[PDB]
Amino acid sequence: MMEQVCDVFDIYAICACCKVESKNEGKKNEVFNNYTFRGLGNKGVLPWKCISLDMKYFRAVTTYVNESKYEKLKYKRCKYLNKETKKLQNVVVMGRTNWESIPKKFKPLSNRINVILSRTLKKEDFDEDVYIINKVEDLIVLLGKLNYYKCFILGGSVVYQEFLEKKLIKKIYFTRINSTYECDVFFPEINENEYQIISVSDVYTSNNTTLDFIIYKKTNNDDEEEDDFVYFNFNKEKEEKNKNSIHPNDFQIYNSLKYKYHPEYQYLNIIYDIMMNGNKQSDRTGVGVLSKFGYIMKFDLSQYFPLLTTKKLFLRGIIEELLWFIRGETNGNTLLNKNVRIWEANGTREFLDNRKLFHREVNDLGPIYGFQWRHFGAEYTNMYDNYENKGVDQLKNIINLIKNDPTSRRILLCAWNVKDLDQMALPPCHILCQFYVFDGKLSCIMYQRSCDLGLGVPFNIASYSIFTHMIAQVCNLQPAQFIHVLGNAHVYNNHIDSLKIQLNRIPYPFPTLKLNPDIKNIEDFTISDFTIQNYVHHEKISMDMAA
């Protein structure tokens, strides 16, 4: 073989990039890609004030060392140099401009061997314990003479540019700051053919912005308790049911990722599990699906708003549906007048007649969600009736229980009214919501009996995450977790090709949801009280590509 310099001396690059203030030349239908995150700095300093989580991450990565692994690292390097043979520390290299941006109390960077690249400055110009080098090659010379774990290139742009340039980077620890700031310096555009993403972290919120961490890798080129594992799997199937009908070769990017910790993967992995292990069934006359039974997803609303990023989604419609529910409405015309067609097909003359609702007016969806939420138990008449003080106002009741009896285990909202089922345009999919309160934080579990993974679920996750935010707010609580329990989870065969494409896309840090803070009652929300900020997503996809 022919050892590569970056491999022998373990040279890595670590950075943090925000989005750049681009000029809206006429289309807000912005096209997003990895290059969306490229802002490095502005006016000699970072573009942002303080994002402490990234600092913590930066410090942890650049200071972490594994002494037990060094003995191996040393041998490799000496062998490479043909020179067969104080806590261990990592080396950090940075441009002069980067060095000058660091506050005096933080330089030199603690527990790290600091190296600075410069031409205009010499060792005499520095009081600190640091190594000065005037050219990339000197670093390689220095590294061959030092005892260190790993080497991290900290920037700036010029420094990144030349290192990536000479392919002296083994991996790029890239922090994606999902917010926009003014920038004058940028990270070099990464050659998609020279570097591939191999891992994505969980998403977090720090100093009013979400962010995640991804890793780019450079293109290709007791043991007795380990056998017990092999024995215990003596009775496993070599393959997966639909493997031959799906072909893993199609999920190259998806399978090539080592660490998939981004929350969106809970959704993506379920899609994958169903495609590979789902049972073939025939739900509605003709149409076919792949199905599984029993899944659970958890989204941390305090850290992000889980709006899928591997495809484009709009929320105006589902928000109006939600306000429609809250108003206790069952009149489909209200949504149609706002150009929301979610329920249009379930309210036609033909659809109603086939549900045996011959005496139901067009678009009168019957005692569905809204009616059940505000009047469960009342006798449904028509969509124009005034059901004031009729039935059980569940909504009002759960809000009251959350405010005065937070530890109660009976805080549930249920739409599955067994008596009214046949009067509904169709039985509800979202059976119930149960709330949980701890230390001023509100969590919600929603049980879905039937789940269309390809089309519905994406919207369903958003609907209830927003609802949890709304309920938390009017009860003076902070949103915590939104827990989605899936009963019959299916993938329509018509969606397969589209989901294959989606599964090979890498998620972007999630966006955030902002609610007008003045709203103190669940019934006072209007469409303009909701704001989805920093939504970065891939190209929209039609689940079924029929034409």
Ligand X SMILES: CCc1nc(N)nc(N)c1-c1ccc(Cl)cc1
**Catalytic residue annotation:** 429
Residue given tokens 């285990």 in the structure block:
409
Residues sharing a CB contact under 8 Å with residue 274, sequence separation 6 or more, in sequence order: 290, 291, 292, 453, 489, 490, 491
102 lies in the binding site for ligand NDP (CB under 6 A): no
Question: Is residue 101 a contact residue for ligand X (CB under 6 A)?
Answer: yes
The whole-angstrom separation of Cα 168 and Cα 149 is 16
Least distance in angstroms from the C-beta of 231 to ligand X: 11
Exposed / middle / buried, residue 361 (Cβ in 10 Å: 0-12, 13-18, 19+): middle
- Cα end-to-end span (Å), the chain: 52
- 3-state helix vs strand vs coil in the chain, percent to 5: 35, 25, 40
Residue among 116 and 536 whose Cβ is closer to ligand NDP = 116
In this structure, are residues 467 and 513 in contact, taking their beta carbons and an 8 Å threshold? no
- What is the residue-wise DSSP string for 271-327? HHHHHHHPEEE--SSS--EEEEEEEEEEEETTT------SS----HHHHHHHHHHHT
Q: How many helices (H) does the chain have, and how many strands (E)? A: 17, 20
Beta carbon of residue 456, minimum distance to ligand UMP (angstroms, whole number) = 2
Site for ligand X in 344-403 (CB under 6 A): none
Using the 8-state DSSP alphabet, how is residue 125 labeled? G
If binding is defined by CB under 6 A, does position 157 make contact with ligand NDP? yes
Q: 462: annotated binding-site residue?
A: no
Do the annotations mark residue 449 as ligand-binding?
A: yes
Q: Which of 214, 263, 260, 203 is nearest to 53 (CA)?
A: 203
Closest-CA residue to 343 (of 414, 429, 431, 445): 429
Q: Does the annotation list 40 as a binding residue?
A: yes
Which of the listed partners (ligand X, ligand NDP, a second copy, none) does 54 bind, with a CB threshold of 5 to 8 Å by partner kind?
ligand X
Nearer to ligand X, 148 or 173 (CB): 173
| 56-75 binders of ligand X (CB under 6 A) | 58
Question: Which of residues 14 and 368 has its CB atom nearest to ligand NDP in the complex?
Answer: 14
**Contact letters for ligand NDP, residues 5-34 (x by CB under 6 A):** ----------xx------------------
Task: Tell me which residue of 171, 257, 262, 175 sits closest to 213, measured CA to CA.
Answer: 175
In the range 43-82, which residues lie near ligand NDP by CB under 6 A? 44-46
Q: Which is nearest to 456 in space by CA: 485, 414, 431, 490?
A: 490
Compute the least distance from the CB of residue 416 to ligand X, in Å: 48
375 is in an annotated binding site: no
Count Cβ neighbours within 10 Å for each residue of 443-482 and write b for 16 or more, e otherwise.
bbbbbbebbbbbebbbbbbbbbbbbbbbbbbbbebebbbb
In the complex, the smallest distance separating the C-beta of residue 540 from ligand UMP, rounded to whole angstroms, is 18
Of 145-164, binders to ligand X (CB under 6 A) are 154-155
Distance (Å) of CA 84 to CA 74, 78, 142, 531: 10, 6, 18, 63
Tell me how far, at minimum, the Cβ of 96 lies from ligand NDP, in Å: 4
Pick from 51, 159, 499, 522: which binds ligand NDP (CB under 6 A)? Answer: 159
Give CA–CA dist 507/502, Å, rounded. Answer: 10
- From the CB of 289, what's the least distance to ligand UMP, in Å? 8
CB of 70 to ligand X, least distance (A): 23
Does the annotation place 42 within a ligand binding site? yes
- Print burial letters for 252-285: b (CB count within 10 Å at least 16), e (below 16): eebeebeebebbbbbbbebbbbbbbebeeeeeee
Entry field: residues in the chain = 547
Q: Is 355 annotated as a binding residue?
A: no
Residue 120, marked binder: yes
CA–CA dist 255, 347 (Å, integer) = 43
Least Å from the CB of residue 203 to ligand NDP: 18
**Which among ligand X, ligand UMP, ligand NDP, none contacts residue 65 (Cβ within 5 to 8 A by kind)?**
none
- Cite the beta strand spans of 311-402 per DSSP E: none
- Identify what 55 binds: ligand UMP, ligand NDP, ligand X, none; CB under 5 to 8 Å per kind: ligand X
* Helix (H) / strand (E) containing 197: strand 195-200
Show contacts with ligand NDP in window 502-521 (CB under 6 A).
none
Task: Choose, by CB under 6 A, the member of 37, 38, 41, 190 that binds ligand NDP.
Answer: 41
Residues of the shown chain interacting with ligand UMP in the complex, contacts defined by CB under 6 A = 284, 409-410, 426-427, 429, 450-452, 456-457, 460
Handedness of CA 55, 61, 62, 63 (dihedral sign): positive
Q: Is 102 in the site for ligand X (CB under 6 A)?
A: yes
Stretch that binds ligand X, among 20-28, 30-38, 95-103, 410-418 (CB under 6 A): 95-103
207 binds, among ligand UMP, ligand X, ligand NDP, none (CB under 5 to 8 A by kind): none
Contact 178, 209 (CB under 8 A): yes
Binding window for ligand X (CB under 6 A); candidates: 52-60, 228-236, 334-342, 393-401 = 52-60
The yes or no reply on residue 503 touching ligand X (CB under 6 A) is no
| Total of chain residues touching ligand X, rule CB under 6 A | 13
By the 8 A CB rule, do 300 and 469 touch?
Answer: no
Q: How far is the CB of 385 from ligand X (least distance, A)?
A: 59
Q: Is 207 helix (H, G, I), strand (E, B) or coil?
A: coil
- Name the binding residues for dUMP: 284, 409-410, 429-430, 448-450, 452, 460, 490, 492
Please give the annotated binding residues, written as ranges.
Answer: 16, 40, 42, 44-45, 96-98, 118-120, 135, 156-159, 162, 284, 409-410, 429-430, 448-450, 452, 460, 490, 492
Residues annotated within the binding site for NADP(+) are: 16, 40, 44-45, 96-98, 118-120, 156-159, 162
Residues in touch with ligand NDP (CB under 6 A): 15-16, 40-41, 44-46, 95-98, 101, 117-121, 134-136, 154-159, 162, 185
| Residue ranges that bind ligand X, judged by CB under 6 A | 14-16, 54-55, 58, 94, 98, 101-102, 154-155, 175
